[PDB]
Design a protein around this ligand. Structure first.
Ligand SMILES: O=c1[nH]cnc2c1ncn2[C@@H]1O[C@H](COP(=O)(O)O)[C@@H](O)[C@H]1O
Ligand SMILES: O=c1[nH]cnc2c1ncn2[C@@H]1O[C@H](COP(=O)(O)O)[C@@H](O)[C@H]1O
Lengths: 164, 164
């Protein structure tokens, strides 16, 4: 009974699957000979993370963190590691900006960002996104891990509501 | 370059996909008219969780917890909710046993368990598993979210090593 909202942004499970596989392939190529450490930003990015890692045929480690201050700390060391932050959607960029400064403080070998979506018209602070799934217009999206008042994270596709 | 180990347990991505879809269907049927709250036990169950929820066409909420004592607490209320714990693999059952007592203490409306795997020959404490993916022989498995010294969680299939 998965039903799309009536918003302007709509991305099918098929379109998402293909893009994620493409991103995984790019990462595998860019990180050949390396062992990246992917950090999933909970809760929204967990499905993107699950699909993305399965498309990266390289030896790698993972960790999970919650941010909003951080509600969940890192468990594995990141110093000297080639880190890849996995985000759901970059809106104003404030959260990612804070996260990047936090991670850089531990002196990782490098840090790149993978994000399923980005709403650049809302950007308040410039943050990098090396692996972007889709650039979209300003709209509240949900599904594929992203919530609407805690619900709808289970929709296999990305949908949205009207600003109304 | 995803390569299987030489252990006795081997489960393909295809076999896993079909089983997870079956489990999701059962849950959707069993919980018709309800709004379950699925709690993913990190880190191992995150991929099973990602695939499972996308196979449950019902309105539902989610949360994530880390256990080993708990390393990550619950954020959403569970009192009066129909809770479904999502685990990666039940070995001795000690962890799940502790988790169930913890959750029951908050008086949820009900609690059921979904687990991808179970090694019953290792069971030290009897714990319920209402939605089980596969019952397997005693072996150390990895892949599909489960790690081998933090690595191999990204394998799209379940594999194993030899006890040797
Ligand atoms: O359109 C949306 N749908 C769902 N969540 C969103 C949306 N926009 C922003 N968020 C959440 O806000 C968090 C940080 O947003 P930011 O700090 O403004 O870039 C993201 O990681 C999302 O969890
Ligand atoms: O064969 C295995 N492979 C990977 N992890 C395992 C295996 N067996 C047990 N575990 C981990 O041990 C945790 C709890 O095991 P238990 O308390 O003995 O039932 C599970 O949630 C897994 O994360």
């Amino acid at each position: 009974m998965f039903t799309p909202g009536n918003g302007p942004v709509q991305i099918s499970a098929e379109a998402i699957k293909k893009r994620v596989e493409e991103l995984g392939g790019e990462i595998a190529r860019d990180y050949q000979g390396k062992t990246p450490h992917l950090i999933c930003v909970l809760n929204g990015a967990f499905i993107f993370m699950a699909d993305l890692v399965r498309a990266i045929p390289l030896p790698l480690t993972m960790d999970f963190i919650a941010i909003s201050e951080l509600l969940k700390d890192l468990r594995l060391p990141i110093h000297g590691r080639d880190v890849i932050v996995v985000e759901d959607i970059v809106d104003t960029g404030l959260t990612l900006s804070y996260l990047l400064d936090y991670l850089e403080a531990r002196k990782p070998a490098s840090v790149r960002v993978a994000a399923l979506l980005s709403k650049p018209s809302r950007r308040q602070v410039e943050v990098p996104i090396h692996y972007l799934g889709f650039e979209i217009e300003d709209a509240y999206v949900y599904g594929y891990g992203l919530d609407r008042a805690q619900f709808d994270r289970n929709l296999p596709f990305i949908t949205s509501i009207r600003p109304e």
